[PDB]
Design an enzyme around this catalytic site. Sequence first.
Site, PDB file in Angstrom:
ATOM      1  N   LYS A 152     -49.289  -2.302 -24.466  1.00 27.33           N
ATOM      2  CA  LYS A 152     -49.439  -1.886 -25.822  1.00 27.33           C
ATOM      3  C   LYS A 152     -49.979  -0.418 -25.908  1.00 27.33           C
ATOM      4  O   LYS A 152     -51.198   0.061 -25.910  1.00 27.33           O
ATOM      5  CB  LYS A 152     -50.569  -2.807 -26.368  1.00 27.33           C
ATOM      6  CG  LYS A 152     -50.659  -4.237 -26.149  1.00 27.33           C
ATOM      7  CD  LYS A 152     -49.851  -4.820 -26.973  1.00 27.33           C
ATOM      8  CE  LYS A 152     -49.916  -5.058 -28.160  1.00 27.33           C
ATOM      9  NZ  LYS A 152     -48.708  -5.684 -28.857  1.00 27.33           N
ATOM     10  N   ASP A 208     -37.583 -10.902 -32.319  1.00 27.43           N
ATOM     11  CA  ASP A 208     -38.461 -12.109 -31.885  1.00 27.43           C
ATOM     12  C   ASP A 208     -39.108 -12.540 -32.962  1.00 27.43           C
ATOM     13  O   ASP A 208     -39.392 -12.240 -34.217  1.00 27.43           O
ATOM     14  CB  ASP A 208     -39.684 -11.063 -31.027  1.00 27.43           C
ATOM     15  CG  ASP A 208     -40.723 -12.033 -30.584  1.00 27.43           C
ATOM     16  OD1 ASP A 208     -41.372 -11.706 -29.950  1.00 27.43           O
ATOM     17  OD2 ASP A 208     -40.394 -13.225 -30.553  1.00 27.43           O
TER      18      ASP A 208
END
Lengths: 350, 406
Positions: A152, A208
Amino acid sequence: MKALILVGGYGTRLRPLTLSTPKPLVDFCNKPILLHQVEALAAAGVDHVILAVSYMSQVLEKEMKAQEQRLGIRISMSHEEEPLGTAGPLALARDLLSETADPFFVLNSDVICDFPFQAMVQFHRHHGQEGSILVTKVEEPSKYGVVRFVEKPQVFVSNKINAGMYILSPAVLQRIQLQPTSIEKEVFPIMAKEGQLYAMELQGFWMDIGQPKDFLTGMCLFLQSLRQKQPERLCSGPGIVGNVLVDPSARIGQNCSIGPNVSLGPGVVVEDGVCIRRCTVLRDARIRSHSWLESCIVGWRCRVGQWVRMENVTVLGEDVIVNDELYLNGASVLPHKSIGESVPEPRIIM
Amino acid sequence: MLKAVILIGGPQKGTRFRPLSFEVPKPLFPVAGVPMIQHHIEACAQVPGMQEILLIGFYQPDEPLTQFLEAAQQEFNLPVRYLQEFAPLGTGGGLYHFRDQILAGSPEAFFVLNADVCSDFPLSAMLEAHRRQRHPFLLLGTTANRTQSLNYGCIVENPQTHEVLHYVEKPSTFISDIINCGIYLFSPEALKPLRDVFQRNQQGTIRLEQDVFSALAGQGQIYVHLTDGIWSQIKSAGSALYASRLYLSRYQDTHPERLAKHTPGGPWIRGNVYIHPTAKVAPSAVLGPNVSIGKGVTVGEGVRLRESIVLHGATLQEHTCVLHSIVGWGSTVGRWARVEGTPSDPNPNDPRARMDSESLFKDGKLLPAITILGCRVRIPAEVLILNSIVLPHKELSRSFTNQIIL
Ligand SMILES: Nc1nc2c(ncn2[C@@H]2O[C@H](COP(=O)(O)OP(=O)(O)OP(=O)(O)O)[C@@H](O)[C@H]2O)c(=O)[nH]1
Ligand SMILES: Nc1nc2c(ncn2[C@@H]2O[C@H](COP(=O)(O)OP(=O)(O)OP(=O)(O)O)[C@@H](O)[C@H]2O)c(=O)[nH]1
C-alpha cells in the site's frame, strides 16, 4: 500444466452477498465467478485444477462435483480445518502441485479479466525465473498496490497494480510454510528481494470484483467485452437500452426501460414499467411495477415492491422484501430482512 | 340578521407561505380543492340570517381576488365585499376602522374569522351560546396538548360560567390546555372597548389578542365556547396539506360528492381523494389517501399520488411517485421521478409536532418537511426531489435532497 485457485476466504467485502453463498459462487453475469475462471482455464489447456477451499465447504462440494462433468477437466478439492491465509493452500497441496515439475498458475477468485494464459506461459518461459505475475495499469494508485515491491504505497512509486494472476514454478512450493501466511504480502516481498518474479501487462478489461461498487463496474466492463466478442449473447429490443444480459429464464414486462449494463439472472420477474440501469439482479428476484433501480445489486429471491426507488449501490442480500413506495440510497441490507421505512442515507440494515 | 368578517391578511402575512404565495394570494390557495376562504364563506352562508360577508385585508384587488369575489357572490347567494384597509392595521384595528360598514344595518352580532384557520366552523352552536348569554366577546377554544399549547394563545377560563379569566398570546410556561381558535362572535358593544384601545394609542394598529383579549380577561366581557371538532392553522406553505387532509376527512359529512369513489374502470382510489372533473387521471394511477387534484391536471399511468396537493395545470408523467408534496401550478414531473416529502402537521394534540416556526433550518440542516414545488417547475425524468423546496420557474436537471433550490 496444473492450476491453483484460491477460494474460501470469507468475503468480508461483498459482505451482504457473501453471508449467503461464498464469494466464488456469486453469479457474476449469469455465471459464478469460479465457473468463469475454470471455464477459461479448461479452455486454456490446463488438465487439472486445485481449489483451495476453506469457507463454506459443502456448497462448493456440491457445485464443483457437479461442474467437473461439464468442463471436461479434473478438479481436486483441498479442504483445511483452519482458514490458512493465502499461501497455506500451496503448503497443504504441496504433494500434488509438485507432481510434475511444471510451472503452475495461481489465480485469485475475485479477479475477472481477459485471461491471457496462453501468452503468459510464453512470457514465463522467456526470463527463466521462478514466478511471473499479471500487472495492470490503473489511473489512481493510492487505493491500489503497485509493483521493486510495495503493498500500500499511496506514493506513486509505480503505476501498475497486481492483477491476481501468477505462475509459480515448484521451487517456491517447498519454500513456504504450512502455518498461515498470505502469499501476496510477505512471500512476494522476499520474492522481490530474490529477483524471481516478473511483471507482464495485458491490454485492458481487468476488474477485481470483491467490493460491490467494483462488482458493478466489472459488470459494465464484462458486458462491453460480451458486446464485442459475442453480440448474440446480449438482449435486443425497443425497451432495451445499452448492453442487457437477460437469461432465457428471466421475464421482463412491457413499457419498461431496461437500461445500460443490466444483467438479469435466471428466473427474475420484472413487472410492467420498471426502469433498471447499471444493476445486477440475481436468481429468482422479483421486481414489481413502476420501480426505478440504478447501480444496485438485488440478491437471490428478493421482492422489490412497487414505486421503489433504489440507487447509489444499494445491495440487497438473500430474500429481502422491500415494501412499496420506499426509497433506498446505499442500503446494504442483510438477508431475511423486510424493509418498511425509507433509507435515505448510506446505511447498513441489520 | 348577522354578518361575518373574515380577516384576510395582506402580502406580509403571506410571506410565511412563500413558495405558494408567489403566484396566488394566501387566502386563495386551494385547500382540498376550493380556496382557503371559500370554506369560511361556505360555513357562513349556511347560517340563517347571514346578510353580508366582509373580507378585511390590505391586499390590493388584483384579478384573482375580484374574480373570486364575484364567483363567491354568485355561488353563495350573498353580498361578499372586500374592504381594503389603507394600512396594515393589525387584527382589531381593521375591525375598528370599518365599524361603520360592519354595523351598517345594525346586525345582532357578527362573526370574526381569521382566514388562516381550518375548522368545521361551529357557527350555529356559537350563536346558540351567544343568544343564551349575550356577552361582548365569544371566543372559540379547543383543547390542546400541554406541550403544544405553548405555541398558541392560551385561555384560562372559569369552568362554570365559561368566562375567560386570563389570556396569553404565546406563553413561555404552561398556562392552560385551552387554545384560541381564531373564531369569534362579537356583539356591537364589543366595538366600544376597541375604541378605548384606539384612544389609548393616541397618547391605529390594534392587536386583538394582545390589547383587547389580554386586557379585559376576567372583567366579565370575554367568554369561551369549547369544541373538539377539526382545527388547524395554515401558516407555512406545508400546513396547507394538513388542512387539506382534515377538510377531505370532513367532506364525508358535508360534501360527499366531492370525494371520489373507486369505480373499477377508473383510477384506483384509497382514502379520501378529491379529483376535479377537468383533470384526466389514468386508470393505473393509484391515488392514495388525502390527495386533491386541481383542474387541468394530466396524471399519467402508474402514477402514485399520496398525501399531496397537485395544483391547477400540473402534469405528472408516467410511473411517478409523489408523496407529501405540493406540486405547483403548471409544474411538470417527468417519468420515474420521485417527489417525496416528510409529514409534518401542526396538530395541537400531537405531542411530537413541531412549533411551526419561521426558521426552516436547525443548524444548517433543512428540517424534514413537505416538499414544495413552485409554479412552472420542470422536474426532469428519473430524478428525486427529497424534502426540498423549489422556488418557481426552475427547470432542474439533478437530484436534490434537503435543499432549498432558489
Ligand atoms: N482455502 C483458503 N482460501 C483462502 C484463505 N484465505 C484467503 N483465501 C482465498 O483468497 C482468495 C482471494 O483473497 P481475497 O480477495 O482478499 O478474498 P477473501 O479471502 O474473501 O478476504 P477479504 O479481503 O476479507 O474479502 C479468496 O477467494 C479466498 O477464497 C484461507 O485461509 N484458506
Ligand atoms: N385584515 C387584516 N387581517 C390581519 C392583519 N394581521 C393579521 N390578520 C389576520 O389575523 C390573523 C392573525 O395573525 P397574526 O397577525 O400573525 O397574529 P397571531 O395569530 O395572534 O400571532 P402572532 O404573530 O404571535 O401575534 C392572521 O393570520 C390574518 O388572518 C391585518 O393587518 N389586517
